[PDB]
Design a protein around this nucleic acid. Structure first.
Lengths: 36, 73, 176, 56, 123, 87
RNA sequence: CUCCGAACGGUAAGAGCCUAGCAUGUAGA
């Protein structure tokens, strides 16, 4: 029962971490600055 | 004889009892006679898999309980 | 931009200026190949050029609702909202056929029932052939009488729903 | 001989059916074919030796 | 084929003109048929004349639900058409009525954790 | 002991085994449709395996929700809100 | 022996490009 909610919270945290990692090294943030 | 569920998330959950070797035209006829609509406007999808009105029912491999997304044309 | 007619339009009393056709069918009319071309603007003149070059008379074809250029052009002229004189000019043209067909269809969708009988009645004499697209894609050659009969007497002769014209007996008892 | 005993066995089986069909998805579907249960572990099921009438 | 077109243009004009007059007189014919049935009901025959067919658009040729086969509703939205798809005798087991529902231990209405209703028509 | 062991019936050593169950499985496999029928839901229809041979190796949870994934992820069980994966 | 149910628990999250039905009605010089 609650294990589903725990796994969903863990997956949401992992997705947020992946989004932050892709945005921090993003082409519009990192590679865009690398070309500047 | 098969019981199909023409369903939708908009307050239209109909259950039509149709024949085994029947077509999809008569199935649309039943779904239109039951809920609120005419025959030529109904469209029975399943994730963008548009069911056409010339193939048969058992030929598309539908069985008792298969729910189908209703959409108006 | 296909929202307004130009800047202001005399709203047909039925539903709305652009909404005499069902919302689903008009929403399908917009996103289409035939709409992508000629949507740059068609006010009065280029409509005649686009009308004489489409020898189909039909509504929807295919499982996916695909509008004929006849139907999309009816909708385009409906958004343009031409004056009554231009429509009478299209209704009086005997050389080009489908132009007259579109003129009659538009005068039916937007127009007074008295005007409907006054302008569409004398279109009930031509015994010529007219091509149409069925719902399964296959075409059929029918008579013009069949078209105007389904238009004046029957409901939804095409994919569009008609705006409830009276029975002729009431008008014959009250008017001409 | 105990009718209440058999009825309660059936109720307990239909309860443990819950979360063995509901643990996968939070829907409690209509049918969820019974054979997913009564296959032994020798083939790779559960081994749910049943007493109540579970008609296939 | 201009000679044939003008020949059929009258064939359609005659039918279309026939439908108009046939529709006007129908209002009087319907009232007249009630008048004919009025005198027919009055002094035709005391249980000695029908002149009828008991015509119905779609005959519901029902059967007998086995033990708890669901009450399937055909849906009363389109019956004037008299489509043959309706005449199929919806008295069959759809999904789970194939069973006997008598060998079961005591009873099983619905095992879905929602049995709000309680009725079988025993009384 | 801190575990209620159902041993009041008898003793497995002195009294022996109280029950016998292989004839239950022998009838169950027949009632489920035989080996091929009771199995036929699983994904071995594939798997580079022609016949039934011994190959037994969230391990069991995934193994179970996969081995019956077609017998579970069908349309005649859940509602018909069909959902496609990314790929 | 006719009593027929619906929603949520459901569709990963993503960076580049693009298009749009809607909304204010005024203070003041």
């Amino acid at each position: 029962e609650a294990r589903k909610r725990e796994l969903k919270k863990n997956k949401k945290q992992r997705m947020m971490v992946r989004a932050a990692v892709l945005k921090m090294k993003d082409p519009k943030q990192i590679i865009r600055d690398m070309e500047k | 004889m098969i019981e199909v569920v023409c369903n939708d998330r908009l307050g239209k959950k109909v259950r039509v009892k149709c024949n085994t070797d029947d077509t999809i035209g008569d199935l649309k006829k039943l779904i239109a006679a039951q809920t609120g609509t005419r025959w030529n406007k109904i469209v029975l999808k399943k994730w963008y898999t548009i069911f056409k009105d010339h193939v048969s029912l058992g030929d598309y491999e539908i069985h008792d309980g298969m729910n189908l997304e209703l959409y108006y044309q | 931009m296909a929202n307004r007619t130009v800047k202001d339009a005399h709203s047909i009393h039925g539903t709305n200026p652009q909404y005499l056709v069902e919302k689903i069918i008009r929403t399908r009319i917009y996103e289409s190949k035939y709409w992508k071309e000629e949507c740059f603007g068609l006010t009065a003149e280029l409509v005649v050029d686009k009308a004489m070059e489409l020898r189909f008379v039909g509504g929807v074809y295919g499982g996916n609702i695909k509008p004929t250029p006849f139907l999309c052009l009816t909708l385009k002229m409906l958004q343009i909202q031409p004056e009554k004189d231009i429509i009478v000019e299209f209704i009086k043209n005997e050389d080009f056929k489908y132009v007259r067909m579109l003129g009659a269809l538009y005068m039916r969708l937007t127009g007074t029932a008295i005007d409907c009988y006054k302008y569409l009645e004398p279109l009930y004499n031509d015994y010529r052939k007219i091509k149409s697209q069925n719902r399964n894609g296959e075409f059929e050659l029918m008579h013009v009488d069949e078209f105007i009969d389904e238009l004046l007497h029957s409901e939804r002769v095409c994919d569009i729903i008609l705006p409830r014209l009276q029975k002729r007996y009431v008008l014959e008892e009250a008017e001409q | 001989n105990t009718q209440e005993l058999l009825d309660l066995l059936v109720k307990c089986e239909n309860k443990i059916q819950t979360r063995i069909k509901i643990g996968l998805n939070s829907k409690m579907p209509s049918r969820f074919p019974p054979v997913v249960f009564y296959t032994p572990k020798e083939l790779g099921g559960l081994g749910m030796l049943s007493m109540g009438h579970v008609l296939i | 084929n201009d000679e044939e077109e003008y020949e059929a243009w009258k064939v359609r004009e005659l039918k279309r003109i026939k439908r108009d007059r046939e529709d006007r007189e129908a209002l009087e014919k319907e009232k007249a048929e009630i008048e004919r049935m009025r005198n027919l009901t009055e002094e035709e025959r005391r249980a000695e004349l029908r002149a009828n067919g008991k015509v119905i658009t779609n005959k519901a040729v029902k059967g007998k639900y086995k033990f708890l086969q669901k009450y399937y509703h055909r849906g009363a939205f389109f019956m004037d058409e008299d489509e043959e798809v309706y005449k199929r005798d919806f008295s069959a087991p759809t999904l789970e009525d194939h069973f006997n529902k008598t060998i079961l231990p005591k009873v099983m209405q619905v095992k879905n954790f929602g049995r709000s209703g309680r009725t079988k028509y025993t009384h | 002991v801190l575990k209620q062991n159902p041993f009041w019936w008898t003793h497995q050593r002195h009294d022996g085994k109280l029950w016998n169950l292989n004839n239950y499985r022998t009838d169950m496999i027949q009632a489920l449709g035989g080996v091929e029928g009771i199995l036929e839901h699983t994904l071995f229809k594939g798997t580079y395996f022609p016949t039934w041979e011994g190959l037994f190796w969230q391990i069991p949870n995934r193994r179970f929700t996969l081995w019956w994934s077609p017998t579970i992820n069908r349309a005649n069980v859940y509602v018909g809100f069909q959902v496609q994966l990314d790929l």
